[PDB]
């Protein structure tokens, strides 16, 4: 089972309920507050120990975010932990957002190219994909040497190559094959 | 990225240091126990356990240690 | 780069490697403080690889760093190797010193191709009555004895090594593949007091040793082997015992983490034994004639195991252990036994037929035993006592003494040719010897020491 | 201290207790308000031991009080027992009333 698997039944609960009481970016706050504070190598020991209880667990790492966490943030972390899932909080964070993105009809947009391009060819891609796509396009902007020249343009899953790279690449393919 | 007042509160938690060549055990079955921190213990090493029982390391994997123990378990406890 | 051990279980390690330089499957890496060799397996993904350690594991922990090699298992091949013990690593291990290698090879390699293949038919003499008869041999092809434990199968083959070595001009390759250590030091001083050790590259991994060397000491010999076919020559391969080579991935399979198939094999039985069997063949360039030992667990033919290999030989002699129990020796079944070669347009019909001829008259002594046992041989029809009475003698002239059983009994060995081996056989099929006492063909080599033996 | 029953399949009990509390294998335990006794088999961690029931497990429910004795199954030896029909815990199930025992032993050694 895919770490993606069981941090799905939390990841929706959380966006629903933000969601219908109108507190998307205070969860994505709180979620990634404890994505981060639980990563750390001080916290990730303490939340190893056979000798804690569940309610230990999840009241140190209430006490150490404090302010950042209202009460319904409380209350999912004391279900995280009673359910012995607190390993899964960074996971729960990155599908929440995903769960986001979607609902707010957003798309970020990894770009790679030979060399840098000018803001008039990124505003140019960048209406060509929002057309494409039916949804707000934030373009990730890169360079890569190891591209003989053009752009390639990663949408999540879908990617659309007009490099150079590729074009030798099919020729090597067509030649050997 | 962390804050320095939540970094603050982090440096102040109560998490108790272990060492290497001490652990703690998880459970007891049939002859057969998990044991959580002996972080420098070799493959085929002999472990220690109170009232003069001794184990041996079998199963080295990421988060416990799997001993066989070499006498009668029934003496052995969680903790 | 390098990495960390971050799991060990027996003879498996799990090493965690930064993400931009994880190694490739079948690199080989080796421990820091140790200087242990481990193979990798399989990717598990998050820079983790999986790997089978070639040494012992005890005294190993977490945390100790790990380098890799850039490349697979590399053994010393060529004229170097003849007259040398090498281990699975390509190390010496006969206190001759280091290896006078010009180049080394990689232990994994791919079959040669469907358009490489060899078409020979020229036959083999081995000098053994039943060989020679029913399961005839040929250059460049390969050969199986399949047999339980105590039956012949290391005695058989080592009268074959004596016997082939008379005709043969060229370099031989022998890998111990899970077997005796003492058996390998009698090989080495046996062949070094006879002079015959400078044509001959030992290989050894012996019953003493942890699961990776057991698995993969049958590649290192083979890529001896290869290298000398690939320099055009014509060259013997001998390997111990194949069947040890599977079992030592049976041992490693669970701890893989792979899903056990039927009677607890890895899944893998299959193509683990194909990707070695098709590396041993002729080829366009030079050829192998291989002879292999293939063991038989708790006498069951049907095991998934030697169920696996007939399909791999060109040749099948099969031993028994209820033969073996009456005194005959070799202990071979004429009925389960047989070769490509057996063929008309191969061995002419005066062979053929002889062959034939035995088959079908041990064929219906069989079907006989039940009556003969119950009610014994005087109620049979005078057609079935006259062919009980020349299969109990053909079973006993398919006997003959061998020159590394001396030891044994006192005996003198015998080599017996082909010409001989079809004229006696022909003999008692016509009838010719239906007067001689049934006594006088057990242990006799040639048919005419049978006529000698009945005058006591 | 006491544990609670937290899980029930068949013959198989699970019981919780404090980490400070948790009983030894083959420990007798007591489940309160009903004449049930578990023999602890194996120690599954996180305070939890799995244990097998003397008895039917009918009418059992997850959260019951049940108490640890401090010994294995202990029962009556010597004189007393002679003429006597006992069951596995040394029960007198003879209509005979109670076994005139001065001393008792736990049943493993
Ligand atoms: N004439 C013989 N008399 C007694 N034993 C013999 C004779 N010929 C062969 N053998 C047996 O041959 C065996 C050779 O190896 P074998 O047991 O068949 O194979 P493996 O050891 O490899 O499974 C020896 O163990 C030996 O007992
Ligand atoms: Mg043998």
Redesign the pocket.
């Known amino acids: 089972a895919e770490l993606t698997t069981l941090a799905r039944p939390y990841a929706k609960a959380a966006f629903e309920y933000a969601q219908a009481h109108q507190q998307l970016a205070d969860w994505s706050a709180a979620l990634g507050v404890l994505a981060a504070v639980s990563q750390d190598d001080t916290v990730r020991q303490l939340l190893k120990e056979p000798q804690l209880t569940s309610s230990a667990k999840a009241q140190s790492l209430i006490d150490v975010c404090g302010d950042k966490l209202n009460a319904p943030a409380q209350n999912f972390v004391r279900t995280v932990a009673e359910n012995k899932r607190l390993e899964l909080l960074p996971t729960i964070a990155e599908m929440y957002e995903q769960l986001k993105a979607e609902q707010e009809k957003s798309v970020e947009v990894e770009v790679t190219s030979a060399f840098t391009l000018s803001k008039e060819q990124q505003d140019k891609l960048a209406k060509a994909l929002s057309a494409r796509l039916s949804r707000e396009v934030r373009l990730h902007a890169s360079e890569d040497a190891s591209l003989i020249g053009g752009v390639i343009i990663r949408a999540g899953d879908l990617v659309i190559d007009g490099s150079v790279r590729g074009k030798l690449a099919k020729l090597a393919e067509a030649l050997k094959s | 990225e962390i804050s320095e007042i939540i970094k603050g509160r982090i440096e102040k938690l109560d998490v108790a240091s272990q060492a290497r060549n001490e652990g703690t055990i998880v459970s007891v079955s049939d002859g057969i126990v998990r044991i959580y921190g002996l972080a420098d213990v070799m493959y085929g090493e002999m472990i220690e356990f109170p009232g003069g029982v001794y184990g041996m390391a079998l199963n080295l994997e990421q988060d416990s240690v799997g001993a066989v123990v070499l006498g009668e378990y029934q003496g052995l406890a969680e903790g | 780069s390098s990495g960390r051990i971050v799991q060990i279980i027996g003879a498996v390690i799990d090493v965690e490697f930064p993400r931009d330089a994880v190694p490739s499957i079948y690199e080989a890496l080796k421990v820091q403080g140790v200087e242990t060799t481990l193979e990798v397996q399989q990717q598990l993904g998050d820079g983790v690889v999986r790997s089978i350690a070639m040494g012992s594991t005890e005294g190993l922990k977490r945390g100790l760093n790990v380098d890799s090699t850039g490349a697979a298992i590399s053994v010393p091949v060529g004229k170097a190797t003849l007259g040398r013990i090498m281990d699975v690593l390509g190390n010496p291990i006969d206190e001759a010193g280091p290896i006078g290698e010009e180049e080394r090879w990689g232990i994994h390699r791919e079959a040669p191709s469907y358009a490489d293949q060899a078409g020979g038919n020229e036959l083999l003499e081995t000098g053994i009555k039943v060989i020679d008869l029913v399961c005839p041999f040929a250059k460049g092809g390969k050969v199986g004895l399949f047999?339980?434990?105590?039956?012949?199968?290391?005695?058989?083959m080592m009268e074959l090594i004596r016997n082939i070595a008379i005709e043969h001009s060229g370099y031989s390759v022998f890998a111990g593949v899970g077997?005796?250590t003492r058996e390998g030091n009698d090989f080495y001083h046996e062949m070094k007091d006879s002079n015959v050790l400078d044509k001959v590259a030992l290989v050894y991994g012996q019953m003493n040793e942890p699961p990776g060397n057991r698995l993969r000491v049958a590649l290192t010999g083979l890529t001896m082997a290869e290298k000398f076919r690939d320099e055009g020559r014509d060259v013997l391969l001998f390997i111990?015992?194949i069947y040890r080579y599977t079992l030592a991935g049976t041992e490693v399979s669970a701890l893989l983490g792979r899903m056990p198939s039927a009677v607890g094999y890895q899944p893998t039985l299959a193509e683990e034994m194909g990707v070695l069997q098709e590396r041993i063949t002729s080829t366009k360039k030079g050829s192998i004639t291989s002879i292999q030992?293939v063991?038989v667990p708790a006498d069951d033919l049907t095991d998934p195991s030697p169920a696996t290999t007939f399909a791999h030989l060109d040749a099948t002699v099969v031993?028994s252990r209820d033969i073996?129990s009456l005194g005959i020796?070799?202990?071979v079944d004429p009925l389960d036994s047989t070769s490509r070669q057996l063929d008309p347009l191969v061995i002419g019909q005066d062979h053929y037929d002889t062959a034939r001829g035995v088959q079908y008259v041990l064929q219906r002594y069989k079907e006989l035993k039940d009556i003969i046992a119950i009610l014994g041989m005087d109620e049979l029809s005078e057609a079935d006592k006259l062919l009980v009475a020349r299969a109990r003698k053909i079973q006993r002239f398919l006997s003959q003494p061998?020159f590394v059983?001396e030891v044994?009994?006192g005996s003198p060995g015998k080599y017996v040719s082909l010409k001989d081996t079809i004229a006696g056989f022909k003999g008692i099929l016509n009838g010719d010897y239906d007067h001689l006492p049934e006594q006088a063909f057990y242990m006799v080599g040639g048919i005419e020491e049978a006529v000698e033996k009945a005058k006591k």
């Open positions: 047999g339980g434990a105590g039956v012949g199968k290391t005695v058989n077997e005796r111990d015992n030992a063991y031993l073996a020796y070799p202990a061998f059983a044994f009994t």
